[PDB]
Structure 1
Amino acid sequence: GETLGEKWKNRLNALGKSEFQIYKKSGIQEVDRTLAKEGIKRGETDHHAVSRGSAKLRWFVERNLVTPEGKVVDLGCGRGGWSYYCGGLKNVKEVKGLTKGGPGHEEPIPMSTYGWNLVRLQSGVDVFFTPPEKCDTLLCDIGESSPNPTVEAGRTLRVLNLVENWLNNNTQFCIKVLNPYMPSVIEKMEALQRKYGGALVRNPLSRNSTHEMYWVSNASGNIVSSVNMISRMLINRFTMRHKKATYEPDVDLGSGTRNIGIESETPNLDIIGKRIEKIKQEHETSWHYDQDHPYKTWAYHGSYETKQTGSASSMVNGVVRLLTKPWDVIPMVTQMAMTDTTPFGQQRVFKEKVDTRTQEPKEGTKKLMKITAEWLWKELGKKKTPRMCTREEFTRKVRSNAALGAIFTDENKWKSAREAVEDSGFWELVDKERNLHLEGKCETCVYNMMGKREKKLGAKGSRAIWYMWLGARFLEFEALGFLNEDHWFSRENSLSGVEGEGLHKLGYILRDVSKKEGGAMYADDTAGWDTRITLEDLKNEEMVTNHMEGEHKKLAEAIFKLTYQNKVVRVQRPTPRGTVMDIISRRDQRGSGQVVTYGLNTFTNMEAQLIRQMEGEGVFKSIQQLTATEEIAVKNWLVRVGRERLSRMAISGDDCVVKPLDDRFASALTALNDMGKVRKDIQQWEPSRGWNDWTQVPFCSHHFHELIMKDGRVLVVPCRNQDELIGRARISQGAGWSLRETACLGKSYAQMWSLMYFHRRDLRLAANAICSAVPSHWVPTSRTTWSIHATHEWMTTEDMLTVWNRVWIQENPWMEDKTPVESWEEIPYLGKREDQWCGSLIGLTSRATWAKNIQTAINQVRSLIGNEEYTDYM
């Protein structure tokens, strides 16, 4: 107890629980955190500080003791109070916050306070093991208190030695010095101040229970004198009549994005100009240029007022939760949330995934891609001829409620596509655009980005669905509809394709691929495929026009050149004035209708995988340039083995399965990375990991087992981890729903489980329990899956054993013996250990109790729905 600070510490440790709680607040400045805490709990992301820290930092910033500017690095950001505060500061350009996550430590909170798009917070970082990087401002609020000041000195010195590695001559800084009164800390502080300047300043918002002082860059003052003055002040507050803490107002951190000047995109305004001006004239009443727009790699054209769309909410399907009670304690089931489709939820995803640039492929890569696409269009075009689809074909499609992409119908003029298509006024609008397309002009073909409502383990932000105007969708169908209409990507035509295949018969295809001689089976996922589509890809896909003539070639060239290679997009954004619709543009990336996307993603993925196959086989040595001899080699390889190399793949969209000639493919990565098709959750140059068991190969969110029947017949069945299936079934799409609509949704899940996951003990039990607890005549409602391969044969009131027989026996091409199954008892399960491996609770007492007492839970749901006609399926 030699220093004044140590004398304070002894006195502080001698206090009792109540005297300490009283002393802690005596005469200090305090922010009333109640409105922010409440607002944040309601899900409010604007205005509120995530902690007391924003006010603490503001106290220093307002006095010019620290001037945050340029790149700000915040060490131990916690919830992000200092980071979010800095985000709204004029001279700040970028905020990087690093914090240790996990138990006992605060996790970063997502906020939409002013300049949030310039702030990136990172959890799971021990800053003591982080490589220092360039910054203009270094903030640090690390220092855990302890009754032992020697322990505190050690902790403080560890922080001081850390901050030193991140400091240079021009660095602005605000560093917490937890224990500034210990002699070892004074000594290190003196050394640090001699080199970097600054001084130790006490914040009046600090509690008396701490002697923390901050090392701020713009202050001046003697360390010993400053520290002893705070010890004296802190010792005096012991015996001073409890003065209440002076209440300060909490900080208003505003709202909205910020523009820092990065604009990396040159639009072709001769191509996109008419489209922008039409939007601009239609919204003249609210049109403005927002100088704080967040777009970096997308050209910004202006904004207009719009009414907010999408939801952040998520409801539990009670019918399913009541009938799957052992899963209430499994986090991988319960932490399943719905995606945030609101303008903030969307903007967060845009920032992270969509506002990115893909590097231009090298000269050899470009040659490889052009040669392969030329060859591949000629292959697909052998037994098929490109044609124009018709208005009557399109009309038939909308009438029959068939598969069209995401479409907008002009809510004023027409409420539905059916209402529109049946009106001659709609086709007059189509003709005006058609005639403009015939003269290389585009005026209406603009995409409406809307958040995709998905179930994920979050809550996570939303992916974008690119809606087209029904007229823009017709012009696309007329020109490129033949790819889907005539099945160019069917397995018979494209040998890699799986177009028109139900999700249940995809395992039979993976089995036929495994029958080939070769290496392991590779199933690498691309990190955001649609954003990784270059202008090279778009120009190589356009080459299908070389197989077209006259009016059809001019119309398809308009879709490619004007609408795909020069996209105009409308996206929502939250602002201090309310929600706005932004007009933005991008030349590269995938932006087409959902159906044409599928085909062009299959084509380009078929082409990228053949190139990855040529690389592994050494058909070309370098991507920098392709020699005249390597061109002849690539063309001969394609002409000689191209078709059998296509037969080694199952290519859905961006989703692929490849059984190469050998495992040289695992490390054949230079062309893949250069094409921009970078693999997900793996270091760029780390070799791929394949599978030596086809039943373990992931494809279209499933793996597939071989299932031996009682009669010896073999089924190949779709399977997934059981928690993904239950977790998804237990979440209802949206908010505000009647029990009728919920029970019909759970019934769609139950019947999906009966047709596809019958081999899963817990799922066949839970599915029969839902169908018993839901009135038998009730029609199943809403989508169970987004899957383009989902057949939805479970969306019926027809006997599920009759449907099972039709799918698995009658219509199954890999089922030679057409003998129907007389009962569900005849249908098998996976082996008990196979089932347990894929997430089954079979063999647990809790699951046994659940199964034994399932009639109690069936009756509980029956009571909540009310006495109706029920059939027992148990």
Structure 2
Amino acid sequence: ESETPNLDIIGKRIEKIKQEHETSWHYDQDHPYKTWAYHGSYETKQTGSASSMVNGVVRLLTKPWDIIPMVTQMAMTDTTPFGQQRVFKEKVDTRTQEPKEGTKKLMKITAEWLWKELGKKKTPRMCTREEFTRKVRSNAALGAIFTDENKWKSAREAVEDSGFWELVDKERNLHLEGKCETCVYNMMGKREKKLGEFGKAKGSRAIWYMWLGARFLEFEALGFLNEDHWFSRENSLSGVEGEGLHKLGYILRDVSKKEGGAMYADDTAGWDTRITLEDLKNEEMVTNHMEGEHKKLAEAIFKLTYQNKVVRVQRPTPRGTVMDIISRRDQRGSGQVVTYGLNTFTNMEAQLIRQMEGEGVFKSIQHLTVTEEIAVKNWLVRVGRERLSRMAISGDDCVVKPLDDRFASALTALNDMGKVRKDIQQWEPSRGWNDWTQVPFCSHHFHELIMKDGRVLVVPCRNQDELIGRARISQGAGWSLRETACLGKSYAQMWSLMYFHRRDLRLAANAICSAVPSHWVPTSRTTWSIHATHEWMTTEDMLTVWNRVWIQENPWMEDKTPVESWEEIPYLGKREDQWCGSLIGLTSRATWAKNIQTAINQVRSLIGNEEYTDYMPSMK
């Protein structure tokens, strides 16, 4: 299970790091790395956090959930080097057994077919520095590894300096030689909100980012997959790139119209970690569709920086905090320019193969019969593009409506490819949904909503406890009321646009809007401006948003007749609202709703003497 570094590929980098840190370079033999080649360590200062901050306005306005642990245990993640290392031991420090011969044959035939179909109406191309210069956020991370690279205070200042692009040229000229001297990953813990356990916040995932020079070189050679929308639903059939979250239910309802079995949406456990060097090499086949200088640069990124990664990660130790130089050949580095696009690719390929195994196209990994190989190639030819349309795929999240239900029990290939399902035994047959409105996708399910007009909407919907929990906490420490009042309204605005159809969220949302100064306009998470005459985001121009998104711009809404009142906008049926976590019918909820003006007036008085508006007469 040990990792075999190629020191002819990653060797010059590890050395350059060493040289810049000679006063501290040691070789800890207490290093915990069981499946990653460890190369050294040196001293460094801890970054990260594990605190969470209370949004007082929302917590005061959501009292019935105080008693609900699925709300109240929500916290920010632990991104300290402790939190990272736990995540590392649990998820990133693992090995996937190389797939069997049959599997590798299935994967290559399917990868090669896929790129030819993705390339029928697109052509790979280099991206431009001007293109990079316009896209990059101005405060995106510099991520400098070497001292030659730590000259700028922002990415904007950097891409407007000749000396930045001189560095980029030095590595660019190496890449065209087949060598790499400077592309090293940084590491951090994903800052997000997770349910805690036993009074401890938990880390979530790893985030790997190279420096801004390297990130351009990625973008130069592979950005075209994103910039030219290769994984659009139009181009790839299976993808859903570019569609927002509210529109995804419409994409699912269509998929459901196909004749087939149940609808399956099995999560893969730690997808990025389970990406194998075979995967990494099937993904590289896109270079077969490239040319000239472009082909060399794309090969350089793939072999020297994706299939040969030098990662630089923090580990707590008794003698302060240290920084390990570790290296892995396989795995997707979360934060590579190709993360979203190439997870969609490989997942498309995976599910297809799983579709094939259910249909009988091949009977066993380890061995692909000369005859069977012909049947696979002819199955893609015959039905492959249709099989792709039976799927909705967003990176590793996927929904597959297969031909029959033998899909559920077709798992030899999926497991051998390393794509182990989460929360189910390796060979436990799969759970499948016969009602598309209950299929999870991009952390939601989707309800068909009949309007008072008779028109139908499809709307996103999740367990309420999940949404209230997240509105009630925030980045930071301690408690806050004024500093996160506009943040509460932001959440309220989201509840009214996406989840207007949950009684509790629309009530809570009008409450938060009523309790927050109406003339305050957010300038950051914790700062704002005050306009003397204008209110911000009134219940009327909230309704303008609801129309603009759900009627005017909704391509599944042929009748563009607006709604004139918030009372026109319907709700889910009570039993469904209840099923999806609503508190109606509980006694705590009734009291909360009756005395809601009393709690609004508390928050008002706690905030101070500002200007307020009642958003509640939208529900009478």
Specify the TM-score bucket, using the shorter chain as the normaliser: over 0.9
Distance 2:169 2:551 in 1: 48
What is the aligned-residue RMSD (CA, Å)?
4.0
Higher relative CO (Cα under 8 Å, sequence separation at least 6) belongs to 2
Conservation of the 8 A alpha-carbon contact between 1:363 and 1:623 = yes
Tell me how far apart the structure 1 counterparts of residues 357 and 457 of structure 2 sit (CA, whole Å): 36
Aligned residue in 1 for 2:193: 455
Shift, 1:779, TM fit: 3.4
- The CA deviation at 1:833 is 1.0
Question: In structure 2, what is the Cα distance between the partners aligned to 1:543 and 1:788?
Answer: 55
Instruction: Give yes or no for contact 1:729–1:784 (8 Å, CA) kept in 2.
Output: no
Mapped to 2, the partners of 1:817 and 1:868 lie a distance apart of 42
Instruction: State whether residues 142 and 212 of structure 2, in contact with CA within 8 Å, keep that contact through their aligned partners in structure 1.
Output: no
1:402 Cα deviation after fit = 9.3
Moved more, 565-574 or 584-593: 584-593
Structure 2 residue matching 1:303: 3-state secondary structure: strand
Name the CA shift for 1:370/1:473 in 2 (closer, same or farther; >3 Å): same
Q: Is the 8 A contact 1:778 1:797 kept in 2?
A: no
Distance change in 2, residues 1:798/1:453 (3 Å):
farther
Alignment CA distance shift 1:711-1:590 (3 Å): same
1:757-790 Cα shifts (integer Å, max 9, x gaps): 1000000111111122112233357789999999
* Structure of higher CA gyration radius: 1
CA deviation map 1:46-66 (0-9, x unaligned): xxxxxxxxxxxxxxxxxxxxx
- Asked if the contact 1:325–1:850 (Cα under 8 Å) also holds between the matched residues in 2, the reply is yes
Offset, 1:734: 2.5
- 1:688 is paired with a residue whose SS is coil
Q: CA deviation at 1:444?
A: 1.6
Contact 2:519 2:534 (C-alpha < 8 Å) held by counterparts: no
The 2-side partners of 1:501 and 1:793 are apart by 32
What is the SS of the residue equivalent to 2:233? Answer: coil
CA contact (8 A) 1:264 1:296 kept: yes
Native 8 Å contact 2:255 2:391 kept in 1: yes
Cα contact 1:616–1:665 (8 A) shared by 2:
yes
Q: 1:791 to 1:629 in 2, by over 3 A?
A: farther
Confirm or deny: 8 A CA contact 1:267 1:587 kept in the other structure: yes
Aligned twin of 2:154: 416
CA contact under 8 A between 2:501 and 2:570: conserved in structure 1? yes
CA distance in 1 between partners of 2:554 and 2:363 (Å): 44
Contact 1:503–1:790, Cα closer than 8 Å, also in 2: no
Structure 1 pair 816/724, CA: closer, same or farther in 2 (3 Å)? Answer: same
Conserved? CA contact 2:126–2:294, under 8 Å? yes
For residues 460 and 353 of structure 1, the distance between their equivalents in structure 2, rounded to whole angstroms, comes to 13
1:317 aligns with 2:93: no
Q: Compared with structure 1, are the counterparts of its residues 709 and 453 closer, same or farther at alpha carbon in structure 2 (3 Å cutoff)?
A: same
- What is the Cα deviation at residue 581 of structure 1? 0.9
Contact 1:780–1:795, Cα closer than 8 Å, also in 2 = no
Q: Residues of 2 paired with 1:557 and 1:668: CA distance?
A: 35
Judge conservation of contact 2:60–2:603 (CA < 8 Å) in 1.
Answer: yes
Query: How far 1:404 moved relative to its partner?
Result: 12
1:858 Cα deviation after fit? 1.6
1:791 positional shift: 29
* Structure 1 position 865, deviation (Å): 2.2
Distance 1:676 1:430 in 2: 36
Identity within the alignment, %: 100
Gaps of 5+ in 1: 1-262
Q: Deviations over 1:208-261 (max 9, x none)?
A: xxxxxxxxxxxxxxxxxxxxxxxxxxxxxxxxxxxxxxxxxxxxxxxxxxxxxx
After TM superposition, give the deviation of residue 557 of structure 1 in Å: 0.5
**In the TM superposition, what is the alpha-carbon distance from 1:630 to its structure 2 partner?**
0.8
Q: Hey, what's the Cα distance between the residues in 1 that align with 2:468 and 2:190?
A: 21
Distance 1:533-1:399 versus aligned 2 partners, 3 A rule: closer
Structure 1 residues 794 and 566, CA gap change in structure 2 (3 angstroms): farther
Q: Note if contact 2:520-2:528 (Cα within 8 Å) is conserved in structure 1.
A: no
Which region of structure 1 is more displaced relative to structure 2, 322-331 or 447-456? 447-456
CA-CA distance at 1:497 after TM superposition: 0.2
Q: TM-score, normalised by structure 2?
A: 0.93
Any idea what SS the aligned residue of 2:530 has?
A: coil
**Cα distance in 1 between the residues matched to 2:284 and 2:126:** 16
- The answer to which of 686-695 and 772-781 deviates more is 772-781
Q: What is the deviation of 1:666?
A: 0.3
In structure 2, the CA distance between the partners of 1:555 and 1:729, relative to structure 1 (3 Å rule), is same
SS at match of 2:263: coil
Over 3 Å counting, the alpha-carbon distance change for 1:286 and 1:739 in structure 2 is farther
The structure-2 alpha-carbon separation of the partners of 1:468 and 1:510, relative to structure 1 and needing over 3 Å to count, comes to same
Q: 1:402 to 1:283 in 2, by over 3 A?
A: closer
**Per-residue CA distance 1:55-109 (angstroms, 9 max, x = gap):** xxxxxxxxxxxxxxxxxxxxxxxxxxxxxxxxxxxxxxxxxxxxxxxxxxxxxxx
Alpha-carbon distance, 1:713 to partner: 1.2
User: What do the CA deviations read for 1:576-625 (whole angstroms, capped 9, x no partner)?
Assistant: 11011110000001115354101110000000000000000000111111
Given candidates 702, 713, 722, the residue that maps to 2:464 is: 722
Q: 1:595 to 1:513 in 2, by over 3 A?
A: farther
Residues 788 and 585 (structure 1), Cα distance of their counterparts in 2 relative to 1, 3 Å cut: farther
- Cα distance in 2 for partners of 1:567, 1:669 equals 30
Q: 1:654 to 1:515 in 2, by over 3 A?
A: same
Instruction: Note closer, same or farther for the CA distance 1:519–1:349 as it changes in structure 2 (3 Å cut).
Output: same
Correspondence 1:685 to 2:423: no
The count of corresponding residues between Structure 1 and Structure 2 is 610
Indicate if the aligned counterparts of 1:745 and 1:781 stay in contact, CA closer than 8 A. Answer: no
Q: Give the stretch that moved more between structures: 800-809 or 472-481.
A: 800-809
Shift of 1:482: 0.6
Whole-angstrom CA distance in 2 between matches of 1:747 and 1:359: 49
User: CA offset at residue 729 of structure 1?
Assistant: 1.0
Q: Is the 8 A contact 1:666 1:690 kept in 2?
A: yes
CA deviation after TM superposition for structure 1 residue 410, in Å: 8.8
Aligned to 1:370: 108
Q: Extract unaligned runs of 5+ from structure 2.
A: 196-200, 616-620
Shift of 1:460: 1.8
SS of structure 1 residue aligned to 2:482: helix
Distance apart, 1:406 and its partner CA: 12
2:593 to 851, 859, 863: 851
Is the partner of 1:625 in helix, strand or coil?
coil
Q: Relative to structure 1, is the Cα distance of residues 411 and 847 closer, same or farther in structure 2, using a 3 angstrom cutoff?
A: farther
Contact 1:748 / 1:784 at 8 angstroms: preserved in 2?
no
Q: 1:696 aligns with which of 416, 438, 443?
A: 438
Task: Give the deviation of 1:315 after TM superposition.
Answer: 2.1
What is the CA–CA distance in structure 2 between the aligned matches of 1:404 and 1:502, rounded to whole Å? 29
CA contact (8 A) 2:190 2:207 kept: yes
Is this contact kept in 1: 2:118–2:235, CA < 8 A? yes
Task: Mark the CA change 1:649 to 1:784 in structure 2 (over 3 Å): closer, same or farther.
Answer: farther
Decide whether the 8 Å contact of 1:521 with 1:691 is kept in 2. yes
Note closer, same or farther for the CA distance 1:471–1:339 as it changes in structure 2 (3 Å cut): same
- The 8 Å contact of residues 406 and 465 in structure 1, kept in 2 or not, is answered as no
Distance 1:584 1:623, change over 3 A: same
User: SS at the partner of 1:403?
Assistant: coil
Question: Is the CA contact (8 Å cut-off) linking 2:143 and 2:212 kept in structure 1?
Answer: no
Give the Cα–Cα distance (whole angstroms) in 1 for the partners of residues 455 and 144 of structure 2.
41
Query: C-alpha separation between the residues in 1 aligned to 2:411 and 2:544?
Result: 48
